[PDB]
């Protein structure tokens, strides 16, 4: 129950439960498959 | 969810453990690519590492102090701490600072808690309950000059009155001018040759001003204000390397000269355990 | 008895909170409303009405004359007036727009700047108004001025010209109190050809100038105005 | 061939024609109307003299010269003596009215000058003394003569400083009130229709004026060479939808 | 909502930027009438400029003071601040005043907050909790004469009792006699030759009276009352030019003589930037 | 939920979301179209 | 008036609790979000990027 | 609710304003029995004069 | 919502909205019509 | 335990407020009402009865 009118006044947000490290761990242009050779 | 699957002997032409790090990727290698594993489940979600959780607890961001005393003959209230202010900023106290600067841009609502406690250094009598007034003074608003100016009327400016010993709490929406707050800014406010460099130019969010509403009693009373800040509804972009050297200034990246080696030297060889 | 816990902030008085209160006058019946023309709902409604700018600020005591921008017959190439666009300060500051902007911390949007010509009907003139977006200096000659937002105004039957300063900005809000990073540009005006008076006529002619906000406009984060203060409470 | 420019207003037994108008303003976009029952309070049936009061009265003329500061008239005061409008006024306890104001000033295509014609609802004047000195009655009830902002301070009178609208606000912002300019080069008249604006449904016509009409030179008058240096300004005003109520003995007012 | 539509080159006989300001209109010209624009959306509603919002925060409207002391031998309680009153009015403190006088007629309910803090100037002992009584005394009601008159019985008159250091809060419906409150009034109360001119005649809303209920202790205690007022359910008609000169009196428009130029003089030419 | 009986005791009103500047910006008797000549 | 009882802990400030508060700036409209590459949601996302180890610590 | 109805000239044999107070009654005479009135509504209920309100503070 | 068991403990009563002055203003035995003669 | 916040005005006594209170005499039974002629409901009922005016005030 929100007792207040504005959105800033609500409690903390709830877990992204998004999670996708590939923008950080695999930003390569041509896709690399694990097990296939790195450099062909 | 499985944390590890079962995997047995391998004799392949398909080697997942040989890679080329020059590419910039961190290939997702697992225990089961190089030893024989058994199934195990995660039993865990990663709840407490969510950025909302990481930045979402109150941190002390500022400690100031004001006193209640006879202003009779004081030529400069501000200077007597008859009231004081604070040039709002979140980078002055450095525990919360290292946490935020793990990101480049950050967006969130703030919840402030203000604790005010009183001290009577000079042996005293009866302390009459002091009421603090915290008022937000945004950029381009009549800054207050005495502890009882017309400014304190605060007819258009949000102000909270609470008692010393108590706590005040309220929450302010994300007031940034852009889409996010810059944790870093490699720019200037304009292309002058001598203008300051950093964020300080970017982060002029105005100051907050405190005073006691009470007139003076016979003794003097020191009131020390602690401002706590909790981020709620957090959004963070672009992770960066954590801060290694100590901080020297609000808003610049500068570290102190003749600082000490930050990497612990081995007591022994490279070969040592 | 239901168990409760009180949180931090209990008992505080926040001048901006909005809650219910007991009525001191239970059951009282207010006077009926009758109809009155003119109801205002938003300050955004009124900052779109244009008002005069004391552009000619060069006097030494407030006078009707600082509303008049003078024009000289037969000058060529030269500059009529110049000003920066800090709507919360300087010429703008006493105008209704300036005066309202000062109740808020941030503004964004387009401005409408118009000039009404008051010279004899048998005279003629062509002026250029130029808006210079942030990043360059106030133009120093028309050549410099004409490379940015501009309108050649031809003085005719239609007495006023409405120039718009379109919102040109990186950051989506600027501060109303003058700030650098957040600065908006310059506005200048020059003779395009020149003012020409008919025979039997002489002297200076004046332009009146107005400012109002486009429907585009946004103002946010209310605060107190530097435009009013006091030293003791008034009495009757 | 209709132009915004030519107009005819016929009201009662009197007609005005202008061949050089600049549209007309209707305050707050509302046209004068009678007092509806739903808004009524006094139980008295009202009197609506119609055409005998709703006609055009031309006040005495003013003279714009290069030194003029501006003039100010109050309504219904300015009309306190015009024909049957005025009688009705002194004889009923309450009355209510809207007006058509037509300000006239013609020159030639060699003159320059620009007047602001503005209507200010509830124009409470300031004492030039400062402090909390009041402005006596007579001073705010000049009658058809109106107040001449270039006349001298008098005692018990209002301040007559133009950059301050006679009240502590700047001339430049008067444009938030219904108004129209007379720019010799464009215009030769100004016309404003005023609906009745008050916080009560009907009021006293003598203790309270509900609008001041103000004509202020802003771009100074500039006549052609060796022309006489002045022009007359004439103000003609017509009560419209007038209603009077609470008839009796006939008010006696100061001075 | 679009803030700007896309618009390209124009070579017309239809010129929206030439107008005649003599007409009294402000023609609704937009950026796209005179430059080439691209589409952009507003992303904004104009929420915080609603008049309910503008007049809806608490503003300090009055600061008074009363003291608790032995009334023995006081011939004039009112005069000893044994109790004091206030001739209710909203025009005495001038921050809120400029805001209201942007309109001619205004109609709203009021929410009052009253903060009372105590001061003990003369070196003291134990302060026994004082209870303030605020009572509303409307026009034609027995004004109180001593700090403990029959008046304070207040059997028909709303009164609130709260403790010094605390706050009292209650809300009073729109008590105006007409349909709106006049922010301005160019009239008199009758056609006399010397009767006051203004609103003061119109706005006689009676006074509010405060006192301490406690009898006296051995020391003296100063209690200072601050009344805050918040408009709720606001309705405003007929905008006017903002106040330029300083105020001198409650209820008159009068400005001070030899005031200073209110328009900032240029440091330079008309041509200056 | 109102806890109190009288209307004055309720919280602040809610946004007009009315907004019509034409009574102030265009109180002219004969309608002016943008683009058409001001004075005909 | 509804009868209540307050429990132990009333009035405490726990830096880790998560509740509602009045907004000091009623009705204010924040700047629109635009898109920015790089959003982080979990610290678990970033500790999977490898970084260099100063293994040769002997200096 | 109407506070006053509209009423015009009268020339009758039916005089509501002449009564005999000796009877002990207060005859319910209204403005419209003796002057010409216009319609007006009450806009009011008499809420704050209820005895519960009068003795209830 | 009453939180208490007894009726005395409830808040103030609510407006009679009864209103009939005739017991006080016209307690006459034979009915008087306004407009008809008082004494016949 | 449900989290609460107290507002300005807590603890005040406003002589005009109207709320519930505990009964000191739980379960007591008041005397039955009998009929009494003359009940008044509004002060507006009684100000319509006419009374004499001391017009001749000159004594
Ligand atoms: C980066 C970064 C982020 C921040 C925090 C910005 C917070 C916005 C302004 O903060 C306040 C503080 C106090 C009040 C206040 N109003 C009434 C009392 O305190 C309002 C806004 O600062 N730097
Ligand atoms: C214009 C304008 C508007 C106002 C405000 C009018 C408010 C009505 C009367 O105000 C009060 C104040 C206090 C109390 C009160 N009752 C018990 C304690 O205080 C009641 C009404 O004043 N001028």
Walkthrough of the structure:
Chains B, E: It comes from Human rhinovirus 14 (HRV-14). Chains B, E: It is found in: Virion; Host cytoplasm. Chains B, E: This is Capsid protein VP1. It is classed as virus. This is part of a larger assembly, with three copies of chain A (40 residues), three copies of chain B, three copies of chain C and one copy of chain D (255 residues). Chain A is largely without helices or strands. In chain A, 10% of the residues lie in helices and 0% in strands. Chain A has one domain (1-40): Picornavirus coat protein VP4 (Rhinovirus 14, subunit 4, Irregular). Chain A has one helix and no strands. The relative contact order of chain A is 0.10. Chain C has one domain: Jelly Rolls. With 236 residues, chain C is mainly beta. Chain C has three helices and 15 strands. The radius of gyration of chain C is 24 Å and the shape is elongated. The N and C termini of chain C lie far apart (52 Å). With 255 residues, chain D is mainly beta. Chain D contains one helix and 13 strands. Chain D has one helix spanning 83-91, and strands spanning 7-11, 14-18, 25-26, 57-58, 62-65, 71-75, 92-104, 112-121, 147-148, 179-183, 189-194, 211-222, 230-247. The longest helix of chain D has 9 residues, at 83-91. The termini of chain D are far apart. Chains C and E meet through strand 3, helix 1, strand 6, helix 2 and strand 8 of C and strand 2, helix 1, strand 4, helix 2 and strand 6 of E. Strand 1 of chain C pairs parallel with strand 1 (4-6) of chain G. Bound molecules: the ligand Cc1cc(CCCCCOc2ccc(C3=NCCO3)cc2)on1 (2 copies). One copy of the ligand Cc1cc(CCCCCOc2ccc(C3=NCCO3)cc2)on1 binds next to strand 5, strand 6 and strand 7 of chain B.
Short description:
Chain H: It is found in: Virion; Host cytoplasm. The structure is cut from a larger assembly and holds three copies of chain A (40 residues), three copies of chain B, three copies of chain C and one copy of chain D (255 residues). Chain A has 40 residues and is largely without helices or strands.
Rg of chain B, rounded, reads 26 Å
Counting DSSP E segments of at least 2 residues, the number of strands of chain B comes to 11
Q: Report the CATH C-level class of chain A.
A: Few Secondary Structures
Sheet with the most strands, sense and barrel status of chain A: none
Helical/strand content category of chain A = little secondary structure
User: What is the largest interface, and how many residues per chain?
Assistant: C-E, 96 and 98 residues
CATH topology of chain B: Jelly Rolls
The number of E-state strands of chain A comes to 0
**CATH fold label of chain A:** Rhinovirus 14, subunit 4
Shape of chain A: rod-shaped
Q: What is the CATH class of chain B?
A: Mainly Beta
- Give the helix tally of chain B: 2
Protein name (chains B, E): Capsid protein VP1
Subcellular location (chains B, E): Virion; Host cytoplasm
PDB class: virus
Keywords: rhinovirus coat protein, Icosahedral virus, Virus
């Amino acid at each position: 129950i929100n007792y207040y009118k504005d959105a800033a006044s609500t409690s903390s947000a709830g877990q992204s439960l998004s999670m996708d490290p590939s923008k950080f761990t695999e930003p390569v242009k041509d896709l690399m498959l694990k097990g296939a050779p790195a450099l062909n | 969810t499985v944390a590890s699957i079962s995997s047995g002997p391998k004799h392949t032409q398909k080697v997942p453990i040989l890679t080329a790090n020059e590419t910039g990727a961190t290939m997702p290698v697992l225990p089961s690519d190089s030893i024989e594993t058994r199934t195990t489940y995660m039993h865990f979600n990663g709840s407490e590492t969510d950025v909302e959780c990481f930045l979402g607890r109150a941190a002390c961001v500022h400690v100031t102090e004001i006193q209640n005393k006879d202003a009779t003959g004081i030529d400069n209230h501000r200077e007597a701490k008859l009231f004081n202010d604070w040039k709002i900023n979140l980078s002055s106290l450095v525990q919360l600072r290292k946490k935020l600067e793990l990101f480049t841009y950050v967006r969130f609502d703030s919840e402030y808690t203000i604790l005010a406690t009183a001290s009577q250094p000079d042996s005293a009598n009866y302390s009459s309950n002091l009421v603090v007034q915290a008022m937000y003074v945004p950029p381009g608003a009549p800054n207050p000059k005495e502890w009882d100016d017309y400014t304190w009327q605060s007819a258009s400016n949000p102000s909270v009155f609470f008692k010393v010993g108590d706590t005040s709490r309220f929450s302010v929406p994300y007031v940034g001018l852009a889409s996010a707050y810059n944790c870093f800014y490699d720019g200037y406010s304009h292309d002058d040759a001598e203008t300051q460099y950093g964020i300080t130019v970017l982060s002029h969010m105005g100051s907050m001003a405190f005073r006691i509403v009470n007139e003076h009693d016979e003794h003097k009373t020191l009131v020390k204000i602690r401002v706590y800040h909790r981020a709620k509804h957090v959004e963070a972009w672009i992770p960066r390397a954590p801060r290694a050297l100590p901080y020297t200034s609000i808003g610049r990246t500068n570290y102190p000269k003749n600082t000490e080696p930050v990497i612990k030297k081995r007591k022994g060889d490279i070969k040592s355990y | 008895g239901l168990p409760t816990t009180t949180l931090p902030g209990s008992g505080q008085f926040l001048t901006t909170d909005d809650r219910q209160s007991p009525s001191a006058l239970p059951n009282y019946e207010p006077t009926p409303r009758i109809h009155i023309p003119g109801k205002v709902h938003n300050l955004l409604e009124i900052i779109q009405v244009d008002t005069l700018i004391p552009m000619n600020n060069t006097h030494t005591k407030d006078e009707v004359n600082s509303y008049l921008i003078p024009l000289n017959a037969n000058r060529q190439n030269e500059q009529v007036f110049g000003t920066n666009l800090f709507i919360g300060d300087g010429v703008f500051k006493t105008t209704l727009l300036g005066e309202i902007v000062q109740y808020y911390t941030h503004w964004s949007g387009s401005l409408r700047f118009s000039l009404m010509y008051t010279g004899p009907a048998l005279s003629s003139a062509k002026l250029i108004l130029a808006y210079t977006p942030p990043g360059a200096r106030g133009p120093q000659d028309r050549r410099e001025a004409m490379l940015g937002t501009h309108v050649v105004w031809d003085i005719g039957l239609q007495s006023t010209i409405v120039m718009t300063i379109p919102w040109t900005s990186g950051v989506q809000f600027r501060y109303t109190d003058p700030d650098t990073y957040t600065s908006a540009g310059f506005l200048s005006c020059w003779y395009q050809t020149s003012l020409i008076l008919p025979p039997e006529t002489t002297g200076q002619v004046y332009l009146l100038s107005f400012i109002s906000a486009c429907p585009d406009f946004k103002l946010r984060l209310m605060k107190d105005t530097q435009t009013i203060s006091q030293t003791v409470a008034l009495t009757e | 061939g209709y132009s915004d420019r030519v107009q005819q207003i016929t009201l009662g037994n009197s007609t005005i024609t202008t061949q050089e108008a600049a549209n007309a303003v209707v305050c707050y976009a509302e046209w004068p109307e009678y007092l509806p029952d739903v808004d009524a309070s006094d139980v008295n049936k009202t009197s609506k003299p119609d055409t005998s009061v709703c006609r055009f009265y031309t006040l005495d003329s003013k003279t714009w010269t290069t030194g003029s500061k501006g003039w100010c008239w109050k309504l219904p005061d300015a009309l306190k003596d015009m024909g049957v409008f005025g009688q009705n006024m002194f004889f009923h306890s309450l009355g209510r009215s809207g007006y058509t104001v037509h300000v006239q000033c013609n020159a030639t295509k060699f003159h320059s000058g620009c007047l602001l014609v503005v209507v200010i609802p509830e124009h409470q004047l300031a004492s030039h003394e400062g402090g909390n000195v009041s402005v006596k009655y007579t001073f705010t009830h000049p009658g058809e003569r109106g107040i001449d902002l270039s006349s001298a301070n008098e005692v018990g009178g209002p301040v007559k400083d133009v950059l301050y609208n006679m009240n502590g606000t700047l001339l430049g912002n008067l444009l938030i009130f219904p108004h129209q300019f007379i720019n010799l080069r464009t215009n030769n008249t100004a016309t404003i229709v005023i609906p009745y604006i008050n916080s009560v449904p009907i009021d006293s016509m003598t203790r309270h004026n509900n609008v001041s009409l103000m004509v202020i030179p802003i771009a100074p008058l500039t006549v052609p060479t060796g022309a006489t240096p002045s022009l007359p300004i004439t103000v003609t005003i017509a009560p419209m939808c007038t209603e009077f109520s609470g008839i009796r003995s006939k008010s006696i007012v100061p001075q």
